[PDB]
Subunit: 473 residues, 4 copies
């Protein structure tokens, strides 16, 4: 006698409108949510882009100001090869630091006291770390090394408007040289979006790295950015961001309404599932129910609930960022982008009621079991290839340096991408061992053949077979 | 009794020739049109290439003449990093401008009076734009900024055969520095195609951009080209372009004849459609007709009519360009190229009568409904991925800078192109946040899997199923 | 009664051996031919590589010796931008020419008298070509140009052990500057293959190209190489090339024997075809024969005859090259490589008798008719796209410069290669017209969709359908 | 009566546990082996990476110390073009060698006595090799060459704390100039993994190569590394590598146990095969057995035996390396990586008992016969294309230099990778012969069409047909 109720619970919004006159509130709510969430993501991306751009541009400016003879595009090859070059680089960094206000285009401030843990209240720390004792005498094939690391720190202070020139580097046992300092600045470009510029404290660490002890000392500059509210900010306020706050409260309201409607649908689905279970337990036997329960739960509405929870969390983080309580642009950006993707995907719920528009979703729901079973056997081969290539070809091949990079290289190879570059990276140097080159040939040829021609063909065949299963309604 | 008439309206030109002795006028007219339109496109492309080459080469010469230390291939990285560098760059630009006739290889003319809106009748304008007041004191974590933009303009004039050296830049609140001037020249290379060279006025704007306020000021040069007839041109006229005008009048005549014949075919198709409708309304019931009307209309002839309208418009624009009434080479080039593509495609009309030669068109006409239904579900996923990647990975990934660039990157990824470059762009910098790098990994892996392995397989399966439907006639 | 004869003419060499005891002479002859022809190709490639390397390395050395400030990898961007730069480049070329024996690493000789047609018996010709009269006054928007080309030649002579410094360039009407000279040298590296080094005369032409009249004069160096026998060569002859001549006479003998055997097989096939025709004309009606004739002709043996004719021609050209009667390494290399490919392909004749090993050939012979019918419709779309992209995007896109380059770009795009590079070439410059950029977007997206997703799918489907037709024997 | 025994020998570990209560010892042993072998591979890769990094970084430092004007990324284009440049390069190398301890960042030692075979007990050998007599007079088109190679050696010795400046190069007959010396150093970075640093002797050979005699002398530096134990090593020993030795003995024990269990399974399989053979010989006729023997042998257990033999060999080589008896990191790395890949693959043995998880293996075992039969015909075409492209396009195309490179290029082309780069390499230079360019067009187009569109389609069709054969259990 509830068979028509079950029919009502499982028909399209058009059918529900024709039957009980129920307007598709959730469909139009989802469309509105797509609009507002995408707009909110773009609006947040404006300020996110300003923050990232400020950090990256300041880092590039620091590299040009403090690294001697630095040119763009040579970060990986920037190195010193003679003692004079290393001394000149270190001294150039410190001298440019001392004359920074006179030369720099940006308005940078000396963070007096902040020069790292090695600093004893000074602004810049020029540290050399070497072995406790290192008697490297390769001529006699004798060395006497105490692996304990001693650090000699020269503390440099900007004038309020010298010593570091007496640096004596112990090249035979030098582990590294580092320069730590901090710089304050204000991100004025925030004003283009009617925000209040913040204070950015850049912790700059310049490393002259001798850990390889190979006659070549790479030189690198790194910055850690700390963003905080300005203590005394004064702006004439030629506008505001009411357009931001409107789209934020609208997003919150739409997501809360979606949460309520979807939770109500989950609850009624549970109630109808229990009603069906008891009806079939009185009619048929007991413990009959095994999967009808999961047929009752709407996974699309679970997705909508999760996505709007994510959107609410991202909006709250965004609002806190504009309130400047927290400044974590990466996490907020990830939350908002993931929520935007999920709200765009969630509108496919209403495309399921039509088999002509449900080819992708139905094929997926039919193929995923077989796809996972196939991937169980595929994954062990893939992981064995990953580890073998990472350790054997890692030292020699630029695309096999790290496990993640090896995975990316192999995954791209499965799709026939950068094959000749992968071969030529080994070809250009013969691996400095003909054996390693021959192994690379065998490894790459076998992997490409087995995964493009064999594994991928079967994967596509499984997906096409699922589609063939669901071709006719 | 009209059944043989309907047969006559729906048979091939060979059948029409065998039945009523009708020569295939439209077929041979289309072949002639292909020839003449392609030749006209190439002939126009000669002068179009001369114009584009002149503009691009003059811009490169300007960049080498006015940008200090400029080298090719470094447009994006060209920047100043110290106050001395910025002053030297600005002064070098102005000095090279002042000595241009003495140094430049091209015969450039000073456009006296034209120096932009900021110019008060002078030829060159050296403008600095800064905040109305900017008290950036990052040391005290205090700033006082009035976001109103004040512009100080130095007006520089070439001698008829100094002041700008007293420029005082306010680096703490400088928004940008700009140099505007104009240069006249004559595109003499036009003579190689028996055309009269025109006057090109290049509006050159050099921007030293400090809007980021990040210690790094990018330096760029842009030109806006204005092409106009020379006031007093004198050429000894060693030839003409009657070969151009012949192929232009022939194109116009062929396109008009095609328009007439196709319009006549559309009219007779409409008349026969109405005759069939009334015959079946007297024989069968009423309102019977629903799609036979669209079976009567020949879409190929609609395409031919549209394409020859486009060709006539492009030819008229071309003729006006040679007459120098209008100089809009981009629009004319687009019109002529689109018309050439459409006239080449239109010759497929006569390949439809043969099922062995109609595999592509018939498969398309069968698959497009299902393809569009599938793309309705595919497009929301694609757009969600586009927006998410554009906002989250845009600041970090060079291939995600803009929405169009994100779309191109994702579309290329669907075809397994530049996968490892996309992965390595994030890998090389770790996203400056391990979280963002992990998100990029998840984003790229999920997108590539879902679209290459799943979505694309289904798309190809739909097309192949349509082909299977039409495999046998 | 001849039915067993026809059976004998159409069975495998193993069947022929089991029936009439006929050894497979042609199969082993083909294997021997593969060996000897491949070895001969490699042996010729040694000397071919020496010749090409000598030409390329001499050209690079010339570019470094005669082009001021030249660096490798900047051939396309090498240009002059000021009058002083152009004068310095020209004078540097001439001065380096005059002091060549003192500075150059190679032993170059001055070709006294050979300086081009513009030379009046002098070794170097410094020519400037300009308009007969050119009164370019862009300031008054007036020009007076006589398009006749006047050439002023300065004749420079190396000392037997000045004037050219008085060059006055007419920049306002200069078409180009050229430097022609010739240099003799001896390719001593030939001795590593026991050959006699030849005399190479390099005709060097340095062009300062002002045909664009755009303030930027590209500078390029080209060499034309003439190889001829040395007049008085003296080598102590530490070996010979009997190993070459043995493999050349063996190739000639094997190819002639293959030609004889295949011609005999063609003749007997013709005789049996005529015998079958007359037998079926006496048995059945007349004019019965239509295709059995082409079933009788063995296309594989026609291929073998053509390939061994090519191999004989290539071997004769090779022998003439070692005899130094003719020195045309490119034509001989093309002939020998094409013959090597054809002899490797010809061994597939004997793989046809087995259906398990004949999948590729049988599928081809079944699919080529349908493939050509499909390509008839595909080719018009491809050509329309080619012409449209070549003329519209040619000026702007680096991959659309020429029709062959456009074809290569589109063909690579069909296979999903360099998609993002094609998009980004337009993206990086916005086409200098938003309209052209939008057209490029539409053009590329439509082409890629239609050819990868639609056309290629149908092509693969046709090939797979042919395979399905021949899946079972 | 043994039918249940045969059933027992051919059921899954779960079935064996349910029947006879046999725990799956080999499955858990294989999982443990995967863990321990992968961990051992990573642990060895740490030290392998240190060794390779030390060699590569020392080579880069040597190139920067001894090559005049050297910059990274220009190894292939590094060359001298004038006599002064060559003299300056040679003298700079020798002078930098003489002042190495004063300038170099690394602690290098002079290997007194070791300067190559050309050295008469001196540390550095500056050798020039030229012809016995070479009277190259290209002006008179006459040369007199004795191909015997004379070597003039200047012996340079570092001071214990000049002559080589009198070098007179015979450029007209110079074959090459070489500088041989040796340098000792200690790889201190080994201490980061609690190893004892070794002594590395680098044999440095700098070649100024004039074998082309083309005015351009490439300059290259090569190092051969010899690693040996330090004679008197002293380290305070802040730790050990018991974590390494534990995982090495565990690997040895696990591999030996796997070897024993798999050998026992092979033996019982042989015994049951013989028992079945005799039972069916008493029941049915004789010589009945033909393939049941190979159905009895478990190929997976053969793979496991081979893989654990490889793992034991690699572990023994590793232990010897830490013991410093032998220092062959490449061979040990290859062994350990191959064993890791094989142990990861071997866990697929237990996935065969389930048809849903055995799609890949079953398809392979069904498709490999047909795949090999197809590849028999494919390989001759591929090899003919390889040889033809290698010899004809090798001199001109950068991707066709060597046979292995040609194979990689063609294999990548089969997968639609670097197509436009392959076309553009010929396009950029027109092959310096329009004929060669046209041949390259025909060659590349024909190869790509035939292998992507035709050969690859058939290959995928064969694999898919095998899958279709095994789709249902
Ligand atoms: C310079 O070398 C020292 C000595 O190796 C490094 O100090 C180590 O730093 C890491 C991370 O900061 C710590 O986990 C270790 O405990 C430190 N000591 C040792 C002995 O490893 C230091 O990191 C190096 N500096 C740079 C910038 O690389
Ligand atoms: C230099 O900076 C000024 C100040 O921001 C820019 O002026 C703006 O220009 C745009 C477009 O020309 C206008 O829409 C705005 O109204 C202007 N004012 C402001 C406050 O934005 C100017 O464009 C910059 N110059 C360059 C070359 O980038
Ligand atoms: C320098 O400019 C002159 C003038 O344009 C060029 O001379 C032409 O050369 C081509 C081919 O050599 C001939 O077909 C023409 O008849 C010549 N005259 C004209 C008016 O075109 C000359 O080729 C240019 N030199 C270089 C190296 O480009
Ligand atoms: C410098 O040139 C000499 C002369 O050609 C080369 O000497 C040959 O070296 C190879 C391998 O070392 C030997 O097989 C030959 O027998 C040597 N002589 C000849 C005549 O070939 C020498 O290898 C060259 N040096 C370098 C570094 O290339």
């Amino acid at each position: 006698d509830l068979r028509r109720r079950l029919k009502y619970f499982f028909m399209s919004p058009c059918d529900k409108f024709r039957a009980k006159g129920r307007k598709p509130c959730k469909l139009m709510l989802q469309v509105v949510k797509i609009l507002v969430v995408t707009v909110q993501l773009i609006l947040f991306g404006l300020s996110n882009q300003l923050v990232v751009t400020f950090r990256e541009e300041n880092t590039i400016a620091f590299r040009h100001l403090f690294l001697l003879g630095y040119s763009d595009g040579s970060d990986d090859t920037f190195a010193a090869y003679t003692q004079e070059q290393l001394y000149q680089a270190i001294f150039y960094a410190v001298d440019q630091y001392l004359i920074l206000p006179e030369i720099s285009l940006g308005r940078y401030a000396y963070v007096r006291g902040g020069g790292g843990p090695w600093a004893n209240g000074s602004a810049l720390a020029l540290c050399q770390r070497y072995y406790h004792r290192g008697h490297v005498d390769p001529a006699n094939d004798t060395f006497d090394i105490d692996p304990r690391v001693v650090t000699d720190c020269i503390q440099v202070d900007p004038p309020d408007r010298a010593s570091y020139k007496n640096l004596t580097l112990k090249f035979h046992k030098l582990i590294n040289v580092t320069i730590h300092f901090q710089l304050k600045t204000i991100n004025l470009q925030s004003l283009i979006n009617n925000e209040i510029p913040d204070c950015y404290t850049f912790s700059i660490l310049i490393t002259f790295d001798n850990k390889a002890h190979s006659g070549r000392i790479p030189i690198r500059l790194e910055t850690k950015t700390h963003i905080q509210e300005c203590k005394h900010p004064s702006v004439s306020r030629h506008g505001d961001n009411s357009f931001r706050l409107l789209f934020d409260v609208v997003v919150i309201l739409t997501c809360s309404l979606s949460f309520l409607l979807c939770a109500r649908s989950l609850l009624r689905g549970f109630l109808l599932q229990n009603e069906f279970v008891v009806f079939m337990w009185r009619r048929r036997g007991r413990e009959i129910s095994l999967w009808e329960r999961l047929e009752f739960v709407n996974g699309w509405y679970i997705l909508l609930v999760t996505s709007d929870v994510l959107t609410i969390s991202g909006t709250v983080m965004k609002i806190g960022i504009e309130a400047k309580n927290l400044a974590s642009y990466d996490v907020c950006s990830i939350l908002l982008g993931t929520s935007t993707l999920l709200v765009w995907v969630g509108v496919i719920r209403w495309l399921t009621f039509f088999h002509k528009y449900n080819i992708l979703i139905a094929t997926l729901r039919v193929a995923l079991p077989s796809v996972m079973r196939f991937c169980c056997c595929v994954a062990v081969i893939y992981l064995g290839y990953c580890f073998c290539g990472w350790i054997v070809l890692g030292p020699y091949h630029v695309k096999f340096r790290s496990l993640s990079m090896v995975s990316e290289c192999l995954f791209s190879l499965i799709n026939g991408d950068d094959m000749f570059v992968t071969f030529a990276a080994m070809q250009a140097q013969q691996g400095h061992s003909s054996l390693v080159w021959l192994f690379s040939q065998l490894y790459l040829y076998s992997f490409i053949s087995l995964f493009i021609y064999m594994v991928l063909s079967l994967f596509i065949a499984l997906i096409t077979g699922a589609y063939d299963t669901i071709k006719h309604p």
